[PDB]
Amino acid sequence: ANALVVKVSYGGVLRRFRVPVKANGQLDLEMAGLKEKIAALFNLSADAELSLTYSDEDGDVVALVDDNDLFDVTNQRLKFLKINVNAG
Amino acid sequence: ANALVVKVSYGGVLRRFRVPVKANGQLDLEMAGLKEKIAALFNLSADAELSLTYSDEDGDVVALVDDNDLFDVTNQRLKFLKINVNAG
């Protein structure tokens, strides 16, 4: 009955919020619902371009592009996800 | 007159349901009755390919392909069966 901890950080300020999962198994938001969620935390202009990059299990710097790779984060089995913002 | 606990897990969310046996000794469903049963739990597109892999007694990742290997799960004498989905 549990959520995934997501920690983001832009301009050297770490934040954290939680994302519920369905009974089904997929994460209960999408990129369109995520990009506007990050713009809430940082008082960012939402029209700006967002370059979101997580960390893999085995430490690469992967890119986030679609709701298909948001599916992969569940199967990746990571303890908490960490997402870097690059704007402008 | 008793059932086998099967636990499935796709997108990192565990589920569980039970499967009865006959008086005779075989499991009381088959793959076509199983594959469409898993698609009920996960709201999966049933037209997608399913690659179902159980765990052996001695811990291998065996493949499930047919109703001949579903027979073997009874004789395998496992405490509860665990079935991983790989789609796409």
Author numbering:
A (entry chain B), B (entry chain A): 5 to 92
Task: Give the original sentences from the paper that presented this experimental model.
PB1 domains are protein interaction modules with critical roles in the assembly of protein complexes involved in autophagy, signaling, cell division, and redox processes, as well as the auxin-response pathway in plants. PB1 domains form homotypic interactions via conserved electrostatic motifs molded by basic or acidic surface patches on opposite faces of their ubiquitin-like β-grasp fold. While type A and type B PB1 domains can form heterodimeric protein complexes, type AB members can mediate interactions with either PB1 domain type or engage in homotypic interactions to form homo-oligomers or hetero-oligomers. Our cryo-EM structures of filamentous p62 and AtNBR1–PB1 assemblies revealed that the presence of a tandem arginine sequence in the basic motif of type AB interfaces is required to stabilize a polymeric assembly.
Of the three PB1 assemblies studied, AtNBR11–94 (AtNBR1–PB1) and p621–122 (p62-PB1) formed homogeneous filaments of constant diameter that appeared best suited for high-resolution structure investigation by cryo-EM. Image classification of segmented PB1 helices revealed that both AtNBR1–PB1 and p62-PB1 polymerize in two different tubular morphologies: a projection class with a ladder-like pattern, we term L-type, and a projection class with a serpent-like one, we term S-type. Further analysis revealed that the occurrence of L-type or S-type assemblies is persistent along the individual helices in micrographs of AtNBR1–PB1, whereas for p62-PB1 filaments regularly displayed transitions from L-type to S-type symmetry. By indexing the layer lines in the Fourier spectra of AtNBR1–PB1 filaments, we concluded that L-type is a two-stranded helix with a pitch of 77.2 Å and 11.47 subunits/turn, whereas S-type is a single double-stranded helix with a pitch of 68.2 Å and 11.55 subunits/turn. Using the derived symmetries, we determined the 3.5/3.9- (L-type, p62/AtNBR1) and 4.0/4.4 Å- (S-type, p62/AtNBR1) resolution structures. All four structures form tubules of ~120 Å and 150-Å width with an inner diameter of 45 Å and 70 Å for AtNBR1–PB1 and p62-PB1, respectively. The relative orientation between adjacent subunits is very similar in the respective S-type and L-type assemblies of AtNBR1–PB1 and p62-PB1. The main interactions are formed between a double arginine finger formed by two neighboring arginine residues in strand β2 (R19–R20AtNBR1/R21–22p62) stabilizing strong salt bridges to acidic residues (D60/D62/D64/D73AtNBR1 or D69/D71/D73/E82p62) in the OPCA motif located in the β2–β3 loop and the α2 helix. These interactions are assisted by the canonical-type B lysine (K11AtNBR1 and K7p62) in strand β1. In addition to the canonical transverse interactions, the helices are further stabilized by longitudinal interactions Y14AtNBR1/N28AtNBR1 or K102p62/D92p62 and R59p62/D93p62 to subunits of neighboring strands along the helical axis.
